[PDB]
Amino acid sequence: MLFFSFFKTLVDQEVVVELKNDIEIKGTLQSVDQFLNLKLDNISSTDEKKYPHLGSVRNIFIRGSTVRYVYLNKNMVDTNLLQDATRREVMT
Amino acid sequence: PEILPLEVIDKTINQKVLIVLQSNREFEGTLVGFDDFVNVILEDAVEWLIDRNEKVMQHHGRMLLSGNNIAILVPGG
Amino acid sequence: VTTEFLSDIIGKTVNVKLASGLLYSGRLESIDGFMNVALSSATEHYESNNNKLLNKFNSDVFLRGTQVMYISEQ
Amino acid sequence: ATLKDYLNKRVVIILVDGESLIASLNGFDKNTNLFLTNVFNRISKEFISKAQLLRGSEIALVGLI
Amino acid sequence: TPLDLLKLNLDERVYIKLRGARTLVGTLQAFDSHSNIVLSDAVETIYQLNNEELSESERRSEMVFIRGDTVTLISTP
Amino acid sequence: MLPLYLLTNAKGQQMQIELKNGEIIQGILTNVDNWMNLTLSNVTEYSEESAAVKLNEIYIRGTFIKFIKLQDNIIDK
Amino acid sequence: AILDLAKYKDSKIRVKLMGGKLVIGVLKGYDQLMNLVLDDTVEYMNARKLGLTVIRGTILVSLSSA
RNA sequence: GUUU
């Protein structure tokens, strides 16, 4: 439940998403779910080569199981909040 | 009069078992124990890779083999 | 019975193979029901201990459970 | 996060193997299993099926065209 | 418990092996039981074998979330 | 409507399954469960789409299906 | 369950596994989890003869008759 | 039993 909480505070913030199959996509995080699925509004191209076969599409749904990376800015995130929250989380 | 798979594995305890992964690799050893998930304890396992097949290692003591990757069990090797 | 094993070998020197082939030799600090493993004084080798040493971690090593193919004592 | 806003609309689907589809999205469940109609191969522009059911394990991306 | 001995080095530099010859070095901000991670100030090394030869690529990022299912290993550099 | 409901009522129809290995299975659906495990009668399986074994009944695990082509008849049936 | 394995006891079945293995055997036993007990098991990889094998149901992909 |  912790990373769901993390991703909720990122709504309305531009993020880059790297999918396992080497697809990279810039977008505004509009929505997040329990599986960490993502909905990105105002889609844009970070890399020339990696970027897939889109165009008119400006809104996408990304399956959480297929993401490798979500690239953030250090100002989007309070580190100490993250740390104390991880410390709190129980893993058993 | 039904024959249950886990009863068959229960009977092969203290015998030699072949354990075949879903990959090429195989483990032959003495079946010490197993759980409900088919995690498995082997004693002095010979670890193989299969086709000329190279024998990876000779274990000594006890191995816990994750049942997550196990496709087949053969009783008495 | 597999749990009795998990607590029987804690503190002993083990080999932990992963899916990839990579093998880790260390002292078992801790284990969890998800097969997650903690080792200390660990080395990595590919397939066999007799092969070339690929790394020596002076620090503690956390190996993910989903990835472990066995844990074995020597 | 939900595929609700896409119902009955045309969509681009990128599969995990990098394959591409164009289709009308008609049904979906919580595991992302899709029900599709008038499916085509994006690259190929080749008509695949009038109706098709696609497992979620296969999906990587769905876009609203 | 191995997941608690990971809290031990929160805000400490970590080394992470991933599936596909990827490596990450970053300062540990957050994790869960899924092994999902957040790292700050991170550099990611990719070892590729193209044209039968080995090159290693790099990628720097100030903050990154890592889906935990590709994670294989966590230690310190 | 939901994919599963759709399947549950396509019972008795003809349909074509593509599996994760490439094998194609043409048959008439005889049963579905909540995990999309199927059983079909009057079966013909192919090694790939290029095409041929005829089988009386087949059981297919749902985790192994890439997609299922339905008969155009579906919506009204 | 949706498949009644009882009608297949003492018949020869074909079982395709995850990771591309084929196994034809005689069905001796089964469980609700689709774990099988095969006899005269032949694993097709071209030919390999195991005997009385236990197949894990979690990795089972397909099951037909023979 | 599909997103660890």
Q: Could you tell me the resolution of this structure in angstroms?
A: 2.6
Domain residue ranges in chain E: 1-77
Kindly report the CATH number assigned to the domain that includes residue A30: 2.30.30.100
CATH number for the domain running over E1-77: 2.30.30.100
- Which amino acid does the sequence have at A27? G
List of E strands, E1-77: 13-18, 22-31, 37-50, 53-57, 60-66, 71-75
Beta bridge partners of E45: E23
Cβ neighbours for G16, distance < 8 A, ≥ 6 positions apart: F21, G22, G23, G60, G61, G62, G63
Nearest CB partner across the interface for F3, out of D33, D49, D50: D33
CB C48 within 8 A of CB C17: no
Kindly report the CATH number assigned to the domain that includes residue C8: 2.30.30.100
Most B-contacting residue of C23, C70, C71, C73 (CB-CB within 10 A), to test interface: C70
Provide the 10 A C-beta neighbour count for residue A59: 18
How many domains does chain B divide into? 1
Range of the domain at B61: 1-77
DSSP string, E25-39: EEEEEEE-TT--EEE
CA distances for B2 relative to A2, A17, F60, G9, G64, angstroms: 46, 52, 23, 9, 21
Question: Rounded to an integer, what distance in angstroms lies between the CA atom of residue F28 and that of residue F6?
Answer: 15
Helical H runs in chain D?
none
| Tokens representing residue F65 in the block | 């299906």
Range of the domain at D38: 1-65
| DSSP-based three-state secondary structure for E41 | strand
- Which amino acid does the sequence have at C55? N
The b-or-e profile of F9-46 (16+ CB within 10 A means b, else e) is ebeeeebbbbbeeebbbbbebbbbeeebbbbbeebbbb
| Tokens representing residue E71 in the block | 């994670």
Q: Which CATH architecture has domain G1-66?
A: Roll (2.30)
How many domains does chain A divide into? 1
Most G-contacting residue of B11, B16, B22 (CB-CB within 10 A), to test interface: B22
Question: Rounded to an integer, what distance in angstroms lies between the CA atom of residue D22 and that of residue D46?
Answer: 10
CB G41 within 8 A of CB G19: no
| Tokens representing residue E30 in the block | 């957050």
How many domains does chain D divide into? 1
CA distances for E67 relative to A4, B44, D13, E70, angstroms: 12, 37, 21, 7
| Tokens representing residue E35 in the block | 């092994």
Question: Rounded to an integer, what distance in angstroms lies between the CA atom of residue D48 and that of residue D44?
Answer: 10
- Which amino acid does the sequence have at E26? G
Q: Is the CB of D56 under 7 A from strand H?
A: yes
List of E strands, B22-69: 26-34, 40-48, 55-58, 62-65
CB D34 within 8 A of CB D24: no
Kindly report the CATH number assigned to the domain that includes residue D60: 2.30.30.100
CA nearest neighbour of E39 among A19, A5, A82: A82
Looking up tokens 């979500």 gives: A70
Range of the domain at C6: 1-74
Domains contained in chain F, CATH given: 1-77 (2.30.30.100)
Nearest CB partner across the interface for D50, out of F4, F66, F72: F72
